[PDB]
Amino acid sequence: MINAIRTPDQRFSNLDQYPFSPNYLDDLPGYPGLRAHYLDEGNSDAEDVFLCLHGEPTWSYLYRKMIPVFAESGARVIAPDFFGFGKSDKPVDEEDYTFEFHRNFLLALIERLDLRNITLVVQDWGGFLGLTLPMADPSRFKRLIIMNACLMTDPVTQPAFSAFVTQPADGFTAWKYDLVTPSDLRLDQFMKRWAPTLTEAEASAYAAPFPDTSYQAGVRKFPKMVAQRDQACIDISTEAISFWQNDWNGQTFMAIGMKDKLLGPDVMYPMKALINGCPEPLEIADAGHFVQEFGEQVAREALKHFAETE
Ligand SMILES: [Cl-]
């Protein structure tokens, strides 16, 4: 019904530091015939669930350094790949991908797996989407680990969440240009540019899911949605602000990648004030946008912060 394609299994043969077994679902209500991949690590019967959401133009591979730390603590860790990324199916038309398409997949996943006691771990798109989830079923959410992310609200309600789109020129402007313009988009080269500490191997794992451009429609659409926010996105992200500010009673841990030209400190400080009870952020000086690349440390420090309240 939704025309999609699937990456050949052989593209993931040679992955570096990703020994996690695949789990798939192809029976989600609203996504017929589409197969979603997700990792499910640690004790399946654990009380605590770490729901790890990735963003553009990545996949669960991004949390590979945090997963073992959260698992080792006794938690179950869920790390789904959005349709159009990783090992999940990829709709071939850019028009199929919208903010609700991705947000409703997550609410479906969460219901399907019956996830409870959720510690939400987000960044980038994982956070644009993920921060609008708790208000849909607040009983399932208990903690939040937030890295460089904000809400896709309208320019007037929160100028900080809109200003980065236009400036600086080597910020989101550069990001979007690198992603939606080339007719020969090489993810490994893009990642090496935006996360300069990746090895060749790690960079290659980020291109793994896309053999050619026909597999990249979701990758092309995400940056356009940051630039052109539809009405549902705006209304939903605007209502989320109220949730975080007045309804949220959980534990929060915030980590900022200080070299991020996109969602760095001028975006993170304002998010921190809207999140009720958000403590002082852990600023990682050498980290850029992809804070997970410096994940072991964020994982360790947040568990340490959350233990100190149990
Ligand atoms: Cl983006």
From Swiss-Prot:
Protein's UniProt keywords contain Transcription regulation: no
Activity's dependence on pH: Optimum pH is 8.2.
Record flagged with keyword Ion transport: no
Pathway: Xenobiotic degradation; 1,2-dichloroethane degradation; glycolate from 1,2-dichloroethane: step 1/4
Family: Belongs to the haloalkane dehalogenase family. Type 1 subfamily.
Keywords recorded for this protein, A-Z: Detoxification, Hydrolase
Function summary: Catalyzes hydrolytic cleavage of carbon-halogen bonds in halogenated aliphatic compounds, leading to the formation of the corresponding primary alcohols, halide ions and protons. Has a broad substrate specificity, which includes terminally mono- and di- chlorinated and brominated alkanes (up to C4 only). The highest activity was found with 1,2-dichloroethane, 1,3-dichloropropane, and 1,2-dibromoethane.
Biological process according to GO: 1,2-dichloroethane catabolic process; response to toxic substance
EC number(s) reported in the record: 3.8.1.5
Cross-referenced Pfam families: Abhydrolase_1
InterPro entries named in the record: AB_hydrolase_1, AB_hydrolase_fold, Epox_hydrolase-like, Haloalkane_dehalogenase, Haloalkane_dehalogenase_1
GO molecular function, one term: haloalkane dehalogenase activity
Residues of the AB hydrolase-1 domain: 49-295
HAMAP family: Haloalk_dehal_type1 (MF_01230)
Protein name (database record): Haloalkane dehalogenase
Catalytic activity field: 1-haloalkane + H2O = a halide anion + a primary alcohol + H(+); 1,2-dichloroethane + H2O = 2-chloroethanol + chloride + H(+)
Subunit structure: Monomer.
Thermal characteristics: Optimum temperature is 37 degrees Celsius.
Gene: dhlA
Binding site for chloride: W125, W175
Residues annotated as the enzyme's active site: D124, D260, H289
Source domain of life: Bacteria
Regulation: Inhibited by thiol reagents such as p-chloromercuribenzoate and iodoacetamide.
